[PDB]
Design an enzyme around this catalytic site. Structure first.
Site, mmCIF file in Angstrom:
data_model
loop_
_atom_site.group_PDB
_atom_site.id
_atom_site.type_symbol
_atom_site.label_atom_id
_atom_site.label_comp_id
_atom_site.label_asym_id
_atom_site.label_seq_id
_atom_site.Cartn_x
_atom_site.Cartn_y
_atom_site.Cartn_z
ATOM 1 N N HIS A 16 0.812 -1.225 0.000
ATOM 2 C CA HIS A 16 0.000 0.000 0.000
ATOM 3 C C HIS A 16 0.845 1.276 0.000
ATOM 4 O O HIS A 16 0.944 1.974 0.997
ATOM 5 C CB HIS A 16 -1.015 -0.040 1.131
ATOM 6 C CG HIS A 16 -2.075 -1.080 0.934
ATOM 7 N ND1 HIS A 16 -1.955 -2.366 1.415
ATOM 8 C CD2 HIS A 16 -3.265 -1.033 0.283
ATOM 9 C CE1 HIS A 16 -3.029 -3.061 1.079
ATOM 10 N NE2 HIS A 16 -3.841 -2.275 0.397
ATOM 11 N N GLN A 49 -4.596 -16.661 -2.724
ATOM 12 C CA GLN A 49 -4.791 -15.915 -3.962
ATOM 13 C C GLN A 49 -6.022 -16.417 -4.668
ATOM 14 O O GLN A 49 -6.812 -15.651 -5.210
ATOM 15 C CB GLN A 49 -3.581 -16.024 -4.903
ATOM 16 C CG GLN A 49 -2.340 -15.308 -4.399
ATOM 17 C CD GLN A 49 -2.569 -13.831 -4.103
ATOM 18 O OE1 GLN A 49 -2.668 -13.440 -2.931
ATOM 19 N NE2 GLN A 49 -2.672 -13.004 -5.165
ATOM 20 N N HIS A 82 -6.119 7.219 -3.855
ATOM 21 C CA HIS A 82 -7.109 6.416 -3.149
ATOM 22 C C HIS A 82 -6.576 5.676 -1.911
ATOM 23 O O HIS A 82 -7.374 5.158 -1.142
ATOM 24 C CB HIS A 82 -7.801 5.435 -4.110
ATOM 25 C CG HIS A 82 -7.124 4.113 -4.196
ATOM 26 N ND1 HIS A 82 -6.139 3.847 -5.109
ATOM 27 C CD2 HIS A 82 -7.264 2.991 -3.453
ATOM 28 C CE1 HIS A 82 -5.696 2.615 -4.927
ATOM 29 N NE2 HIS A 82 -6.365 2.073 -3.928
ATOM 30 N N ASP A 83 -5.261 5.603 -1.719
ATOM 31 C CA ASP A 83 -4.682 5.038 -0.483
ATOM 32 C C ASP A 83 -3.683 5.989 0.164
ATOM 33 O O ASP A 83 -2.789 5.550 0.870
ATOM 34 C CB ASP A 83 -3.991 3.702 -0.764
ATOM 35 C CG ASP A 83 -4.953 2.581 -1.023
ATOM 36 O OD1 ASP A 83 -6.080 2.655 -0.484
ATOM 37 O OD2 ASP A 83 -4.596 1.594 -1.732
ATOM 38 N N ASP A 86 -8.232 -0.964 -8.644
ATOM 39 C CA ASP A 86 -7.552 -1.166 -7.331
ATOM 40 C C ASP A 86 -7.012 -2.599 -7.140
ATOM 41 O O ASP A 86 -5.938 -2.809 -6.584
ATOM 42 C CB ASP A 86 -8.544 -0.825 -6.191
ATOM 43 C CG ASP A 86 -7.884 -0.703 -4.791
ATOM 44 O OD1 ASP A 86 -6.636 -0.597 -4.669
ATOM 45 O OD2 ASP A 86 -8.667 -0.673 -3.792
ATOM 46 N N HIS A 141 1.497 1.160 -5.943
ATOM 47 C CA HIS A 141 0.135 0.642 -6.005
ATOM 48 C C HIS A 141 -0.840 1.664 -6.580
ATOM 49 O O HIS A 141 -1.606 1.355 -7.480
ATOM 50 C CB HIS A 141 -0.341 0.207 -4.625
ATOM 51 C CG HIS A 141 -1.806 -0.041 -4.561
ATOM 52 N ND1 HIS A 141 -2.445 -0.871 -5.442
ATOM 53 C CD2 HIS A 141 -2.763 0.480 -3.767
ATOM 54 C CE1 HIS A 141 -3.735 -0.890 -5.164
ATOM 55 N NE2 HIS A 141 -3.953 -0.081 -4.144
HETATM 56 C C1 LIG Z 1 -8.795 -3.028 9.048
HETATM 57 N N1 LIG Z 1 -8.424 -3.379 7.664
HETATM 58 C C2 LIG Z 1 -7.311 -4.326 7.642
HETATM 59 C C3 LIG Z 1 -6.883 -4.628 6.203
HETATM 60 N N2 LIG Z 1 -8.013 -5.131 5.387
HETATM 61 C C4 LIG Z 1 -8.274 -6.567 5.596
HETATM 62 C C5 LIG Z 1 -9.389 -7.137 4.729
HETATM 63 N N3 LIG Z 1 -8.945 -8.268 3.932
HETATM 64 C C6 LIG Z 1 -8.371 -8.171 2.673
HETATM 65 C C7 LIG Z 1 -8.186 -6.933 2.044
HETATM 66 C C8 LIG Z 1 -7.562 -6.900 0.815
HETATM 67 F F1 LIG Z 1 -7.484 -5.717 0.164
HETATM 68 C C9 LIG Z 1 -7.068 -8.025 0.173
HETATM 69 C C10 LIG Z 1 -6.356 -7.976 -1.117
HETATM 70 O O1 LIG Z 1 -6.157 -6.902 -1.696
HETATM 71 C C11 LIG Z 1 -5.905 -9.299 -1.656
HETATM 72 C C12 LIG Z 1 -4.994 -9.684 -2.656
HETATM 73 C C13 LIG Z 1 -4.449 -9.072 -3.854
HETATM 74 N N4 LIG Z 1 -3.724 -9.705 -4.743
HETATM 75 C C14 LIG Z 1 -3.431 -8.871 -5.795
HETATM 76 C C15 LIG Z 1 -3.910 -7.624 -5.709
HETATM 77 S S1 LIG Z 1 -4.787 -7.427 -4.251
HETATM 78 N N5 LIG Z 1 -4.601 -10.967 -2.386
HETATM 79 C C16 LIG Z 1 -5.228 -11.417 -1.266
HETATM 80 C C17 LIG Z 1 -5.074 -12.754 -0.604
HETATM 81 C C18 LIG Z 1 -4.092 -12.854 0.537
HETATM 82 C C19 LIG Z 1 -4.434 -12.387 1.806
HETATM 83 C C20 LIG Z 1 -3.540 -12.447 2.866
HETATM 84 C C21 LIG Z 1 -2.300 -12.995 2.630
HETATM 85 C C22 LIG Z 1 -1.951 -13.456 1.388
HETATM 86 C C23 LIG Z 1 -2.828 -13.396 0.331
HETATM 87 O O2 LIG Z 1 -0.630 -13.833 1.380
HETATM 88 C C24 LIG Z 1 -0.218 -13.779 2.747
HETATM 89 O O3 LIG Z 1 -1.253 -13.158 3.508
HETATM 90 C C25 LIG Z 1 -6.026 -10.431 -0.803
HETATM 91 O O4 LIG Z 1 -6.839 -10.441 0.284
HETATM 92 C C26 LIG Z 1 -7.273 -9.251 0.827
HETATM 93 C C27 LIG Z 1 -7.921 -9.334 2.047
HETATM 94 C C28 LIG Z 1 -9.190 -4.229 5.496
HETATM 95 C C29 LIG Z 1 -9.555 -3.959 6.947
HETATM 96 MG MG LIG Z 2 -7.603 1.532 -0.168
HETATM 97 ZN ZN LIG Z 3 -5.856 0.352 -2.937
#
Ligand SMILES: CN1CCN(CCNc2cc(F)c3c(=O)c4c(-c5nccs5)[nH]c(Cc5ccc6c(c5)OCO6)c4oc3c2)CC1
Ligand SMILES: [Mg+2]
Ligand SMILES: [Zn+2]
Length: 308
Positions: free
Chosen positions: A79, A265, A119-120, A230, A83
């Site tokens: 982030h 993924q 946006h971030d 995004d 990105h």
């Molecule tokens: C308080 N906040 C805390 C942060 N957030 C958590 C919500 N869950 C979120 C938020 C996200 F955006 C993503 C996100 O953008 C994801 C992407 C992308 N791949 C390509 C482009 S984006 N890959 C994975 C899977 C993943 C998740 C966790 C991992 C991992 C792989 O490898 C090791 O750990 C994603 O899961 C997500 C889970 C939102 C709430």
């Molecule tokens: Mg964002």
């Molecule tokens: Zn973003």
């Protein structure tokens, strides 16, 4: 120093869109220097007719871009400025290659590009919510859009900053409309919001009732487009996607090795990405390169996931 970077930027010629590769959905930033992303970003504005239509001064746009870049944290793994830059790039590509430019107003486009880039802003890391903790409690309503309200705060902060007012060529009515949409565009990047609104978007595609002349279905589409951009690293040529998954993973563990990653993924693809890039493609099937990329990435993460 720093005034350093602006002199370089303000002076240099901006290569064409063809030359910078920014029209490709397959775009990668890894080779580029921060300096070269700034140029890509200027080209994004210029080639979308925004510099012309809203009579932006070149020195101003340059200083806005560097101020935006400055306001991300390099210490955060995914982030960060790259990105945001990629998200804008994807929004560029989707407008040109995906032929969405023709389906939108100029103010709409202007606001989406500024949104995507912004946006971030100031994101501190996914497992590292200092924005959450040192805030007024009564952050329990859990607008989730709460990080995203921070991002828009910061987007507006820079927009307003002296030197940086790339929207000063707008009329007061235009400025109001534009900002409205930037707000919606950035708040749309909260995934909770996407989950809550996508049904309506898919119903309209499924039931074939979809219509952008309806102002409500416009806004909807713009939220979905923002999400598409995004997430768009998920669509990249395999060896890019793998590296990006690496950064994501770094951040998602560091405030059963790469072992966990493949399953996750695929989870994320299936749960979130697939259906969106399907819908986008129905609306405009020149966006198919994203769907295709998303699916190909899935095959590849699935195959590995099965202890290859
Ligand atoms: C308080 N906040 C805390 C942060 N957030 C958590 C919500 N869950 C979120 C938020 C996200 F955006 C993503 C996100 O953008 C994801 C992407 C992308 N791949 C390509 C482009 S984006 N890959 C994975 C899977 C993943 C998740 C966790 C991992 C991992 C792989 O490898 C090791 O750990 C994603 O899961 C997500 C889970 C939102 C709430
Ligand atoms: Mg964002
Ligand atoms: Zn973003």
């Amino acid at each position: 120093e720093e005034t350093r970077e602006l002199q370089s930027l303000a002076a240099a010629v901006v290569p064409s869109a063809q030359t910078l590769k920014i029209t490709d959905f397959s775009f990668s930033d890894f080779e580029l220097s921060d300096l070269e992303t700034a140029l890509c970003t200027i080209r994004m504005f210029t080639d979308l007719n925004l510099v012309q239509n809203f009579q932006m001064k070149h020195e101003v746009l340059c200083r806005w871009i560097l101020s935006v870049k400055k306001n991300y944290r390099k210490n955060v793994a995914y982030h960060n400025w790259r990105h945001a830059f990629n998200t804008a790039q994807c929004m560029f590509a989707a407008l040109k290659a995906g032929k969405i430019q023709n389906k939108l107003t100029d103010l709409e486009i202007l606001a989406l590009l500024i949104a995507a880039l912004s946006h971030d802003l100031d994101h501190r890391g996914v497992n590292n919510s200092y924005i959450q903790r040192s805030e007024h409690p009564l952050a329990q309503l859990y607008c989730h859009s709460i990080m995203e309200h921070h991002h828009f705060d910061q987007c507006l902060m820079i927009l307003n900053s002296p030197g940086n007012q790339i929207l000063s060529g707008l009329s007061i009515e235009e400025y109001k409309t534009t900002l409205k949409i930037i707000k919606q565009a950035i708040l749309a990047t909260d995934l909770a919001l996407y989950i809550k609104r996508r049904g309506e978007f898919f119903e309209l595609i499924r039931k074939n009732q979809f219509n952008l002349e309806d102002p409500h279905q416009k806004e909807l589409f713009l939220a979905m487009l923002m999400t598409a951009c995004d997430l768009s690293a998920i669509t990249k040529p395999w060896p890019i996607q793998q590296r990006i998954a690496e950064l994501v993973a770094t951040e998602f563990f560091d405030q059963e090795k790469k072992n966990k990653i493949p399953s996750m993924q695929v989870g994320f693809i299936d749960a979130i990405c697939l259906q969106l890039y399907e819908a986008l493609t129905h609306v405009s099937e020149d966006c198919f390169p994203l769907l295709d990329g998303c699916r190909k990435n899935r095959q590849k993460w699935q195959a590995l996931a099965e202890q290859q």
